[PDB]
Structure formats: structure tokens, C-alpha cells
């Protein structure tokens, strides 16, 4: 007979969202165990027992059979504590109870990228889980028992550990802005038959990230069926060529550099413009000349490379790299991507170009959302947190104020605009933003696809007072249409307006609001 040494499970931290809603928990459950050398010697209550935990009497009475010379075995885990003591009543000898505690998911799907997972073993192995694991976990206490010759258990000697709790976490999520980013991204994908998307939305004067969710997703309380396809936090870890959402930042760079402003009219005819073997190709060729504001509204390639050969590379690769494209967001998400800036010594005209209308750059969606945020607070950046921030941080003056409220303009416009994208008006407010359609890479080698492209639209609002920045990506629509402003633009519409109704902004816009 001898004294063994068992375990205290520890409570592992609670995770809230910004207001204190439960995002992970440690939930108390009991799991039964039993002697088998003491279960022998009450054979006859087997049958109830059996019938008790749902298991066939035969194959119930084969296990303990098996086990006999043993002194310890499972016979089920994390019962409710009802459940446990339920079957304890029952005082068939051989047969204890151990209180534990399992991690649950309040809100499943819906977090589940952002929130990741523990395992077995109570490690967090995904997403904030792991990257906070050390502040979750908390540390087991230790007790002893004595146990006679059959095993069994005859006293609880001693506590030699008392055991610790994990610390409570706090993230910058906002779970009701999370639900309806959530349900409005499932649906478009479904709507477009696309393959993948992620949706961000952001605060725009704290860096908080207010919501993140992406396409296909998983139930993290239930993973039986899991492919590793659906765990990927494609908004931090996935990276994409931007396209013509950049172009707001190429402008940027444009009016910053005394060559431009707003009034100039670029010749944009005959809709292409040849440079070396490479081609760069307008894809609504309907007018000969436009301004600033008409290059973003209709999107000319050749417009901003025009642009984009008068003031250079290195003004724009500066502002792209100032707002934070391609740069480290400082968040240290797990498998979180920085991106690439392409840096070289002589920029060629056609790197120029593809530069100045996204491509050639690689970022992510929360890296996108980021600038648009930098651009829609009067030009001043903020650190990124996904963690609630009590004092709003001291930012960065990336853009001047001049510069981003003139380009804030003409993304109002954008939207606003005859021939604009009106899909991106969101009731009751004014909306600014820009959209973006964008080949994909092809599989297998280099160059891009004919056929599958990924849809973007990237804003703010409201105009007048800008308080939240969004960036809506949705990858191989193939249902109906493929364009930024006809897919991703009605999906920021909706949760835009959805947003700003639960953080109770006023309208800025009435004769359209409800
Ligand atoms: C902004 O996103 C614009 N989109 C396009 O021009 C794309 N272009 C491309 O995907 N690519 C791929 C790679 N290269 C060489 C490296 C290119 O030169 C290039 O342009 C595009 C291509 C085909 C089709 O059918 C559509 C788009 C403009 N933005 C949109 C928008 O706002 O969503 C529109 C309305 C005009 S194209
Ligand atoms: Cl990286
Ligand atoms: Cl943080
Ligand atoms: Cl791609």
C-alpha cells in the first residue's frame, strides 16, 4: 500500500471580447473512473452500471474483464457534474469521480479563427489560444491519496499544491459586430458560390480590431471532421496581390508630390498603353480623358501609370510602405504574414505601373484594412491591438491631413458618384472607399488566370467623421459577377451599416437612413 500522487486541474483564463463576452471558458465537468479489482468483486451490479453509462452490458462487462489485474481505468470522461454524481449515487464499489474542466467555444464558428483552440492536453495549438497560452494557462495543484493492496482508494492524505488559475484575456472584437460580419461573409460566399473570403473590420482612432472572419470556417467544440483547409485565419496569414485598392495610396503619393492636383485631367485614350512587350490595359474604356477623382471612380490602369511614370516608384513604394502595406503589423498572431514591398535599385517602367495599380505587392487583409484606416484618420496611423486598449495610443502622421482629406474626397466620391459604385452606399451614412478585381495567380506556373479572380472592396465611414475601416475579400466568385464593386461592395454596404448602428453612430446622411 502506498501513497499516489494525482493532478488538480487548474482553471485555464477566460477569454472575453472587448465588453465581456465569453469567448472561451473552462467549463467544470466530471469524468468517472474505476478499479477494476474492486468492480470484480461486484459483478452483479455491472448490468446497471452498464445501462447507466450507455453501454452494452457484454461489451461493458468484456472491458472490466480485460482489465482485471489492473487498478486504474476511464470509464467515461467529462460527463456534467450532474451526470457524475448521478452515477456515484448509485455506490457501486470500485467506481470514483474526477472534477475537471473542458474548454468550450460560446460562439463556435463565428470566432473560431481568431479564438483557435486548445488540445487534449489543455495547450492552446491555434489562434489567440496559443498566442496568450502562457497568460491563459494555469498552473495544476497536487494532492495525495492512499490506496491499500487492491488499489483501493482508502484517504485523501493531503493537498501538497493548491492549484492556479489562468489570467483573463480581453481581446479588441467586438462580438456583435462579429456575428453579423460573420453571417454577411457566409452569405455572400453562398450567394457567389466563391471559395474562400475574409472580412475585417477595424476602429479607425484606436487600432482595435473590431471584427475578423473569413470563409470556410470550423466548429472548434467539435472538430471530428476537421480538414486543414478551414482553420486557416486567412485574414493574417493568407497574402494577396491588392490590385486597385491601392491606387487611393498611389494618389496619395501623387498630391504629396507638388507634380499634381485634384483639377488636372489625364488623357487616358485609347484605353491601353504600350511599354516595352507589356501592355497595360484599361478594362472600362468608355472615356478618353479623366480627372483625379474620375481615374479612381472608373479605375484606370492607364490613368494612375501615367500618374506613376511623372512623379516615379519611390514616392509611391514610400507612402505603400509608410501607411504599412507589406510591413510587420506588430501583432504576433500565429502564422501571421507580413507581406512583400518589392525593393529595387532601378524601377523600369512596367514595375512602376504594376506597383502604382497593385500588383507585384503582397499584402494582407488586416494590413489593408490598416492603410484605409491610416488614410480615413486624417492620415494619422495607429498600432494595430487585438487586445481591448483602455488609452487611445499616441499615432503616426503617415499622410498629411491636407493630402488624406482631399483623397478621403474622392473616395467619397467613389461611391457617391453617377457611374460610381453605388453598391458600397450604406443607408443613412456617408461611405468612402475604393474597389478592387484582381486575377489570380495560376496554378503551376507563372503568369495569371484567365477565369478566377478575387473580389475586393476597401472603405470607411461615416465621411464626415470617419470611426471604422472595413475590407471585404472574396476569392473565385462564380455565380454572379466577379467584380469588387458588384460582389464585395454590397457585403460592406450591409455590415457597414449594420456596424455603425450597434456602436450607436448618428447618421451623417439622413434622407437615406431608416
Ligand atoms: C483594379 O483592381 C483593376 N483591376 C484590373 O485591372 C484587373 N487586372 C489584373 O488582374 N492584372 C493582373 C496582372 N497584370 C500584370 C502583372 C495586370 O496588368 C493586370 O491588370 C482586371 C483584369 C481583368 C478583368 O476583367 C478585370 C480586372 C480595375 N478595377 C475594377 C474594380 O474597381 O473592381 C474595375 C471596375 C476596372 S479594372
Ligand atoms: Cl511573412
Ligand atoms: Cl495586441
Ligand atoms: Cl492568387
Keep these: 500500500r502506498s501513497v499516489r500522487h494525482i493532478a488538480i486541474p487548474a482553471h485555464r483564463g477566460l477569454i472575453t471580447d472587448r465588453n465581456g463576452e465569453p469567448l472561451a471558458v473552462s467549463t467544470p465537468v466530471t469524468t468517472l473512473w474505476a478499479n477494476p479489482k474492486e468492480l470484480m468483486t461486484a459483478k452483479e451490479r455491472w448490468p446497471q452500471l452498464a445501462a447507466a453509462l450507455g453501454q452494452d452490458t457484454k461489451l461493458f462487462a468484456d472491458r472490466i474483464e480485460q482489465n482485471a489485474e489492473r487498478e486504474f481505468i476511464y470509464l467515461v470522461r467529462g460527463l456534467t457534474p450532474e451526470q457524475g454524481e448521478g452515477v456515484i449515487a448509485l455506490k457501486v464499489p470500485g467506481v470514483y469521480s474526477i472534477e475537471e474542466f473542458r474548454r468550450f467555444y460560446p460562439a463556435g464558428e463565428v470566432v473560431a479563427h481568431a479564438v483557435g483552440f486548445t488540445d487534449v492536453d489543455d495547450r492552446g495549438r491555434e489562434g ?152 497595360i490595359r484599361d478594362v472600362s474604356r468608355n472615356s478618353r480623358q479623366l480627372d483625379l ?120 466620391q467613389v461611391v457617391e458618384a453617377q457611374g460610381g459604385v453605388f453598391r458600397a452606399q450604406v443607408p443613412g451614412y456617408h461611405a468612402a472607399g475604393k474597389s478592387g478585381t484582381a486575377r489570380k495567380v495560376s496554378v503551376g506556373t507563372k503568369g495569371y488566370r484567365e477565369n478566377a479572380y478575387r473580389s475586393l472592396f476597401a472603405g470607411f465611414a461615416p465621411a464626415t467623421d470617419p470611426r471604422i475601416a472595413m475590407v471585404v475579400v472574396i476569392d473565385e466568385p462564380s455565380k454572379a459577377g466577379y467584380f469588387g464593386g458588384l460582389v464585395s461592395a454590397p457585403v460592406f454596404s450591409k455590415v457597414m451599416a449594420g456596424a455603425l448602428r450597434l456602436m450607436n453612430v448618428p447618421p451623417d446622411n439622413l434622407p437615406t437612413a431608416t
Design 128 to 279: 489567440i489560444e496559443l498566442a496568450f497560452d502562457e497568460w491563459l494557462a494555469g498552473v495544476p495543484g497536487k494532492r495525495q491519496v492512499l490506496k491499500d493492496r487492491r488499489g483501493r482508494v482508502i484517504k485523501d492524505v493531503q493537498v501538497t499544491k493548491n492549484a492556479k488559475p489562468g489570467k483573463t484575456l480581453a481581446l479588441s472584437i467586438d462580438l456583435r459586430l462579429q456575428y453579423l460580419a460573420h453571417r454577411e461573409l457566409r452569405n455572400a460566399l453562398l450567394e457567389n458560390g466563391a471559395k474562400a473570403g475574409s472580412l475585417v473590420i477595424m476602429d479607425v482612432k484606436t487600432g482595435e480590431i473590431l471584427a475578423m472572419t473569413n470563409q470556410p470556417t470550423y466548429n472548434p467544440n467539435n472538430r471530428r471532421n476537421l480538414q486543414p483547409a478551414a482553420m486557416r485565419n486567412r485574414a493574417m496569414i493568407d497574402v494577396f496581390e491588392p490590385g486597385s485598392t491601392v491606387k487611393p495610396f498611389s494618389m496619395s503619393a501623387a498630391l504629396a508630390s507638388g507634380r499634381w492636383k485634384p483639377s488636372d485631367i489625364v488623357d487616358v485614350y485609347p484605353g491601353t498603353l504600350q511599354i516595352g512587350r507589356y501592355t
Design 293 to 412: 477623382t474620375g481615374i479612381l471612380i472608373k479605375s484606370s490602369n492607364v490613368g494612375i501609370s501615367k500618374i506613376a511614370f511623372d512623379i516615379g516608384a519611390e514616392s509611391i513604394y514610400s507612402v505603400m510602405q509608410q501607411v504599412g502595406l507589406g510591413q510587420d503589423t506588430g501583432l504576433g498572431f500565429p502564422g501571421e504574414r507580413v507581406g512583400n514591398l518589392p525593393n529595387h535599385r532601378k524601377w523600369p517602367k512596367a514595375e512602376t505601373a504594376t506597383l502604382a495599380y497593385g500588383y507585384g505587392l503582397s499584402v494582407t487583409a488586416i494590413q489593408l484594412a490598416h492603410a484605409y484606416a491610416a488614410l480615413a484618420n486624417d492620415g494619422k496611423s495607429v498600432p494595430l491591438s487585438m487586445t481591448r486598449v483602455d488609452r487611445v495610443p499616441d499615432g503616426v502622421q503617415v499622410i498629411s491631413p491636407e493630402v488624406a482629406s482631399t483623397v478621403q474626397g474622392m473616395l467619397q
